């Protein structure tokens, strides 16, 4: 699924905006995250 | 889908349902336990 893709590449992107120091950037990355849950679930 | 996808899927409704209660609190330990999940799934 591109959706399931997308999920599995959000959460590395989650990782490295957390090691980087950029909680920020992961709060986007949870909205991106909400955007295709949403769909994946639906 | 696998037992982790379910329990996932539970976790996104209740994101929702804890917002929409005001509970903010919660949205951060569920959002805490989302990725305690999602990393178990990318794991295997
Ligand atoms: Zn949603
Ligand atoms: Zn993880």
Redesign the pocket.
């Known amino acids: 699924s591109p959706l399931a893709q997308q999920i599995k590449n959000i959460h590395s992107f989650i990782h490295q905006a957390k090691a980087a120091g950029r909680m920020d950037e992961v709060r986007t990355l949870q909205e991106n995250l ?1 955007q295709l ?2 769909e994946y ?1 639906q």
């Open positions: 909400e849950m949403h679930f």
